[PDB]
């Protein structure tokens, strides 16, 4: 029943003061995009930065299997929008948060479907 739990390790590592994973690939863009979480092209709004998706995936960056039973990656080959206040740690951000299946925004960082 053993499997490495990489998401837990990174969370505990961060909590004990570890420096976030660096070299996530930040894109140049207009910052007038839709602000949706994961997109086929950079979509940062004024309050976001856009990053190459694979460089923000914990599993891609660590050379480990994805928890998708098919091993498919949500981020690779796409662009992830990260709130500028959290752009010091895109990998930690994408791991800890979830995209709204209705409107495509980050829950609590753009999604207003609960009003």
């Amino acid at each position: 029943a053993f499997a490495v739990d990489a998401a837990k390790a990174y969370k505990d590592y961060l909590a004990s003061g570890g420096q976030p994973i660096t070299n996530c690939v930040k894109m140049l863009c207009t910052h007038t995009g839709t602000g949706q979480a994961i997109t086929v092209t950079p979509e940062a709004n004024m309050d976001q930065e856009s990053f190459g998706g694979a460089s923000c995936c914990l599993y891609c960056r660590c050379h480990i299997d994805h928890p998708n039973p098919k091993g498919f990656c949500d981020l690779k080959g796409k662009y992830v929008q990260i709130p500028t206040t959290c752009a010091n740690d895109p990998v930690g951000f994408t791991l800890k948060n979830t995209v709204c299946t209705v409107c495509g925004m980050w829950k609590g960082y753009g999604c207003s479907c609960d009003q």
Partner: protein
């Protein structure tokens, strides 16, 4: 000059027509660096300006476009140039990248190994190469035409670049190949492009625009590299990040360029004219299949 507000500078045509002897490259602005926007890597900026410049040329942009990117990995294990290329290229463009060492990529497929191990069944609409060995920056020995991966690239272009396709191949003062310059004369137009963010370096991208599959002009590659160095040696380029701040017109326009399968006997002057104007791609539209050779050893 208004060159600071452009993505970079292309080699002026009059420098292409000279017969200079090869000299040492001595850049006035050597060792300076451009001020990059907050948190932007040099390679994101460099590829962004390269793509901004390619937006001004007559690139063919078919449906189901096929782009291959050599030397795509960085010291950091990621692929910044690939991410910019994917942003620039129309959505759905098949993007393959490759490098000698392992890296994490947004490309649709990634081949790890020496580029000479890379084989593809299909032809390509655009070849980008950032391959570079820094062990070539040896100022104490003569500066000869280099082989290595340049030999592969010349063969790859002649065998696997669709007619009408384009290339952008990174060179420096010491990292260059005479046959690659000769091959620029097999395109309808060519230049050497220096990005404004990296203008303090002898780096340029050697760009062949719309491949014709035959010599349109005869270029002596040794003389042309000397002409390139002469241009750099006498034209300081002011470092500039200005163009990085306007991305509104960045995406490559999906021109839907026609693709046709034609045999050599069918490429007449009218076809060659369409190829030259960025209005035609000649290749099959089959499935894209790649592989890398693997040497097998048992060290026991």
């Amino acid at each position: 000059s208004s060159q600071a507000w452009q993505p970079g500078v292309a080699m002026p045509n009059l420098y292409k027509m000279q017969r200079m002897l090869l000299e040492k490259c001595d850049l006035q602005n050597y060792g300076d660096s451009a001020t990059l926007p907050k948190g932007i890597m040099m390679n994101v900026a460099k590829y962004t300006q390269l793509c901004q410049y390619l937006n001004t040329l007559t690139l063919a942009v078919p449906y189901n476009m096929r782009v291959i990117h050599f030397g795509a990995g960085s010291d950091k294990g990621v692929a910044p140039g690939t991410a910019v290329l994917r942003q620039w290229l129309p959505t759905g463009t098949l993007l393959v990248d490759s490098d000698l060492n392992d890296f994490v990529s947004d490309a649709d497929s990634t081949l790890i190994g020496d580029c000479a191990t890379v084989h593809t069944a299909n032809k390509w609409d655009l070849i980008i190469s950032d391959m570079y060995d820094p062990k070539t920056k040896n100022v104490t020995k003569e500066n000869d035409s280099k082989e290595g991966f340049f030999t592969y690239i010349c063969g790859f272009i002649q065998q696997k670049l669709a007619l009408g396709g384009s290339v952008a191949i990174k060179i420096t003062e010491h990292s260059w190949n005479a046959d690659l310059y000769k091959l620029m004369g097999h395109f309808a137009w060519w230049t050497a492009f220096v990005t404004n963010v990296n203008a303090s370096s002898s780096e340029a991208f050697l760009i062949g625009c719309n491949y014709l599959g035959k010599p349109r002009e005869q270029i002596d590659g040794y003389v042309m590299h000397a002409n390139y160095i002469f241009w750099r040696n006498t034209n300081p380029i002011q470092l500039s990040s200005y163009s990085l701040f306007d991305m509104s017109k960045f995406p490559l326009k999906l021109r839907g360029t026609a693709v046709m399968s034609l045999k050599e006997g069918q490429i007449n002057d009218m076809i060659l004219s369409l190829l030259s104007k960025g209005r035609l791609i000649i290749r099959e539209n089959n499935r894209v299949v790649i592989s890398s050779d693997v040497l097998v050893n048992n060290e026991n």
